[PDB]
Amino acid sequence: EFRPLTLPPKLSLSDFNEFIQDIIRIVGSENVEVISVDGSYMKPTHTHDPHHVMDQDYFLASAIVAPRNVADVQSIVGLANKFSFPLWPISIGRNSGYGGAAPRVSGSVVLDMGKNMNRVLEVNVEGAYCVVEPGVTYHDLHNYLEANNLRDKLWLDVPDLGGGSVLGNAVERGVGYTPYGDHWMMHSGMEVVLANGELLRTGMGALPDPKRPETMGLKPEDQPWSKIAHLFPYGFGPYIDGLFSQSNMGIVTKIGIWLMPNPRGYQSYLITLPKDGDLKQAVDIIRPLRLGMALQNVPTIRHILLDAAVLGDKRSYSSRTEPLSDEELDKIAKQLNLGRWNFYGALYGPEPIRRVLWETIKDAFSAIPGVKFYFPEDTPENSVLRVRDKTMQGIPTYDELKWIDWLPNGAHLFFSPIAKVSGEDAMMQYAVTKKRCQEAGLDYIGTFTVGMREMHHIVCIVFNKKDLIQKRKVQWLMRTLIDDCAANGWGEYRTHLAFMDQIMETYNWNNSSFLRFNEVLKNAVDPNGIIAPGKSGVWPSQYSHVTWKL
Amino acid sequence: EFRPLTLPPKLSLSDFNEFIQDIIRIVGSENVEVISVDGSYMKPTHTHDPHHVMDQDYFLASAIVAPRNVADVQSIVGLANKFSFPLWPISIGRNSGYGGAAPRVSGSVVLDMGKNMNRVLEVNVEGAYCVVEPGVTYHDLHNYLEANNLRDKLWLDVPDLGGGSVLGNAVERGVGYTPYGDHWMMHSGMEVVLANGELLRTGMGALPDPKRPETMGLKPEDQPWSKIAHLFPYGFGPYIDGLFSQSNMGIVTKIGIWLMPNPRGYQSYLITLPKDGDLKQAVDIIRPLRLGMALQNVPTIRHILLDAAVLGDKRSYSSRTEPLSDEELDKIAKQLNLGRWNFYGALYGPEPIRRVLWETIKDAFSAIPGVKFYFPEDTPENSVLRVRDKTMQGIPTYDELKWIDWLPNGAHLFFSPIAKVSGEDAMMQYAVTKKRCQEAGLDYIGTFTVGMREMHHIVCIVFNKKDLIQKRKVQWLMRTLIDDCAANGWGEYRTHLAFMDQIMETYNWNNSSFLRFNEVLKNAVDPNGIIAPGKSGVWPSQYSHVTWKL
Ligand SMILES: *Cc1cc2c(cc1C)nc1c(=O)[nH]c(=O)nc-1n2C[C@H](O)[C@H](O)[C@H](O)COP(=O)(O)OP(=O)(O)OC[C@H]1O[C@@H](n2cnc3c(N)ncnc32)[C@H](O)[C@@H]1O
Numbered sequence A, B: 001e002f003r004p005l006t007l008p009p010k011l012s013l014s015d016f017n018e019f020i021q022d023i024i025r026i027v028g029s030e031n032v033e034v035i036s037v038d039g040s041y042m043k044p045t046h047t048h049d050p051h052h053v054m055d056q057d058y059f060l061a062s063a064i065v066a067p068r069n070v071a072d073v074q075s076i077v078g079l080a081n082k083f084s085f086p087l088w089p090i091s092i093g094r095n096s097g098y099g100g101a102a103p104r105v106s107g108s109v110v111l112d113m114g115k116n117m118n119r120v121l122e123v124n125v126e127g128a129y130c131v132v133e134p135g136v137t138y139h140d141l142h143n144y145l146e147a148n149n150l151r152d153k154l155w156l157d158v159p160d161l162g163g164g165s166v167l168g169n170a171v172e173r174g175v176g177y178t179p180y181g182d183h184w185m186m187h188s189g190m191e192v193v194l195a196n197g198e199l200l201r202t203g204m205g206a207l208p209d210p211k212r213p214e215t216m217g218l219k220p221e222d223q224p225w226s227k228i229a230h231l232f233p234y235g236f237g238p239y240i241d242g243l244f245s246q247s248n249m250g251i252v253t254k255i256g257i258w259l260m261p262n263p264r265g266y267q268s269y270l271i272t273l274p275k276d277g278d279l280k281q282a283v284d285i286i287r288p289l290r291l292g293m294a295l296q297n298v299p300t301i302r303h304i305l306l307d308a309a310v311l312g313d314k315r316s317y318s319s320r321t322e323p324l325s326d327e328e329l330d331k332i333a334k335q336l337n338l339g340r341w342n343f344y345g346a347l348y349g350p351e352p353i354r355r356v357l358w359e360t361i362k363d364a365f366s367a368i369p370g371v372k373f374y375f376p377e378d379t380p381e382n383s384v385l386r387v388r389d390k391t392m393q394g395i396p397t398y399d400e401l402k403w404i405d406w407l408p409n410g411a412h413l414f415f416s417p418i419a420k421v422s423g424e425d426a427m428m429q430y431a432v433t434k435k436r437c438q439e440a441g442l443d444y445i446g447t448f449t450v451g452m453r454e455m456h457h458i459v460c461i462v463f464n465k466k467d468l469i470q471k472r473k474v475q476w477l478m479r480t481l482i483d484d485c486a487a488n489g490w491g492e493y494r495t496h497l498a499f500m501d502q503i504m505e506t507y508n509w510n511n512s513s514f515l516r517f518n519e520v521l522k523n524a525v526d527p528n529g530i531i532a533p534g535k536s537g538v539w540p541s542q543y544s545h546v547t548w549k550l
């Protein structure tokens, strides 16, 4: 196809068609589309940001390309170094709240790694891990398990939805909610195509499997892995693995993730917390439970509006256009038998042990006035505890999608600072956020999710994507909240295309020593900057900062 | 001082003198010794390899230098860049059986980081962490916790001995024996002097502590960290920390290590395994128990000669020159009250739960006939268990040095493959190791240390460092094992100065794509090639491969 709306920097129309006619010859026309529509979560777009805060077409691909397999990725990489052509690798492109499939640089080719690169490559019961291609969704992998009666043996650990890419999520360093919720920390042995085109495997993945007749003549891509490949991440040497999470250093083609054995008993729970103010003592209490492992998973602390928004949109509680007052929030709490904060978690293992831990956790929380404890059976059909009772055991679900529709054209954008596991710090941070949402006309919505020693605080910004005045207010909200949080010792863990540069500029200790170091490595491996220029605000040297930053 | 024993490559004598005059001028003449002696473990040699498998003076320093503070590191680096003078950064130098403090490239300035950079910088109780400089040992920190009453609230994690660097050990990805035994994974927020001289902190170390009056005009090195610095490793962006473990990518000046809160309950134990081949069902029993937090820490499976060696030299069990037969080990077993294999563990937490786990564990090893269960109290006062009763509760000893004296002028060399947590694989690794050991005329000595999904097989080669015939036999044994294990799908996790090249040549999947990518990164951040040339087989372009490899 001949004429995209946007060409990549320094590229000509003739060169673009050669590239595209070229690419078609490899992957066949059915896997190539030139752009000359927001889509849904169940069928994501691949051209731009579906939950746009900037114009609908601010981050826009010149085309999408689905490689059939690894060779194609190498084949594509080579043409991009030929023509000097931004690539933007995705697995599924469900990164809503963070850009979705959109490419940081417009005119980039969107590499839809998920469409054909699809296979649950392994599920090893004794080693209690799996191996996975870009397109294996949580749900997918969930299904794979049931078709082979393995659900009786190995559990998944899932994010708040079913559709993300197991490995896509994992290199974004995302988070689920069983003991295996640190997703990045559960990988071992990844395969990568480099900016140069050469195929790499990490850690023990570098120790090749010994030779035998059955595997002779196999192109690298298709070779099996040695025994320890997905068991021990470290390998030998400089441990480069992290170089591929939240960076633009390779295109990940496969990853191994550790899976949890059926623990032999499971029980989830909802402790409700009556006052807004109860955040402080609640978090304080959490600290030792977490740190001494009364708290087994990533439990979460939910603001009333999140749960509520899962239950019905805003027009369903008040035809107010402005934020909900501190009093209506009490009404809605009491309406749904919920607290002003709500604590969700679970218990793993045999009856005898669950009991002791749950009693400890029951005891500790009883210090908070008005606390109430609920198992899943104690709640209405539609409850969040019921939904989460499946999440904390690795069942994929989609009920939590609705909180997006809090507003007539709901789109979410995540502002994601980290917080000490201390009440004082949590209150200070929340206060900063709440003040600011308020100035912007927005309901404050958020979870804190509980790290061992930190807390991911996900301010869930929902806005109406057809409202210009609001979008702008969202853009003023985010930018403001970044600076505020930095002026108080708080960086964010993960962001959106439009915020990557500012956020990085927040991590500027010693005159931006971290970024500089990062640029050096980036130019070294990517001589012609063709891989995802601009991710995490890391720019190859041919991308002028003045021209390309926000 | 004027005329050294070995000069670094390509450097004139004149140059060495203007160089070391400059370093004497910066650090004072008492922080510079020029070489023109083996010592022991407690006054560790800084010049060479105390457990030499090669000639004593093979791996040798030209000078040792002891920087007083961070800025001397910056000046020594600027100068080494100026002169093209390789540096060997050490922390304490107790890396015995991996080279000790010897430089890989003879002629280097050994950089004694630990002599003066020494402070326990912080101990944070609610965050449950510490920051540490290179010169803090395991003992050092332990005395810091005792003289501040902190043993009550926080526990350490120690290897077999107490002299090792907390930070040194950690960047080696070394292993200890509580739930916090994966030393490197417990790190967060590290300081590094880059090869070009610039100071860098990683993770949320890159988030600057917000300006306040008391910290104004402080040299960057002396500055506080922001609050999440040492609670969440990831920060934002590509996750670069692992580029500074088992790499030559920089000199580490500060590291945060997580500390485990007092659990509220403790108890070690020993399970004795009568037959040599009982290793097989043991590992098989440990598998599901490790993966399921009945086994919370890192327990060890010890060979009978490992404990025998702690209680008396070889000359005291046999007057034989050849290795011990099967029967004479059964003899030394029934003697000491031990098995052929011995499993050392510990339960952590409040009694109710300890109780239950321990019944599961006892009950699981009972499928092995002749099994026997001991608490520390049930054993001889000089027992290994009473030594490990301390190691698995954060208390250092020095008792385990005794096994190095299994032969006359004792020296150890570690062969450290990784195995599956399966008895089949473990037997197979054992039988492959046992075969070659006999050929070399050496007794087999070892432990498997039980990672979650992996086992570190530490083959404890002891040899007479004053026996030319046998040291050669050991070199042969080493080089053959590496190869044998590789042909069997096993790689080593860490090794000695003389075997770095071979082991890395072992990880040659897809024509050494791992090394090549590593080399690219090295030449990028270290143009002149001065930080630790040759570490892990990663050579800068100025070091010919033909000239330097082994
Ligand atoms: C809308 C929303 C989002 C959400 C959530 C709840 C709602 C209602 N709850 C989340 C939570 O539980 N935990 C979490 O980590 N994220 C949560 N989100 C956000 C989002 O839905 C999920 O994280 C989702 O998993 C992310 O989408 P996906 O997994 O599909 O990832 P992607 O869209 O394909 O791409 C993310 C980035 O990853 C990098 N990437 C992906 N593939 C490659 C390859 N192989 N090579 C190099 N880089 C790759 C890209 O940078 C990409 O943009």
Ligand SMILES: *Cc1cc2c(cc1C)nc1c(=O)[nH]c(=O)nc-1n2C[C@H](O)[C@H](O)[C@H](O)COP(=O)(O)OP(=O)(O)OC[C@H]1O[C@@H](n2cnc3c(N)ncnc32)[C@H](O)[C@@H]1O
Binding pocket: B089, B090, B091, B092, B093, B094, B095, B096, B097, B100, B101, B113, B134, B158, B159, B160, B161, B163, B164, B165, B166, B167, B168, B169, B171, B172, B173, B174, B175, B176, B250, B251, B252, B253, B400, B401, B404, B412, B532, B535
């Ligand atoms: C003989 C012995 C050794 C031993 C052991 C039992 C016996 C009887 N059991 C161990 C175990 O339980 N677990 C373990 O990790 N090690 C065990 N050892 C081996 C060794 O003695 C110890 O691990 C020891 O703690 C290591 O020595 P040390 O801590 O003093 O480290 P180092 O000599 O200073 O240097 C180690 C390597 O790391 C790099 N390094 C060190 N500092 C820096 C800085 N600051 N910057 C960059 N790199 C650094 C160097 O490359 C050096 O080679």
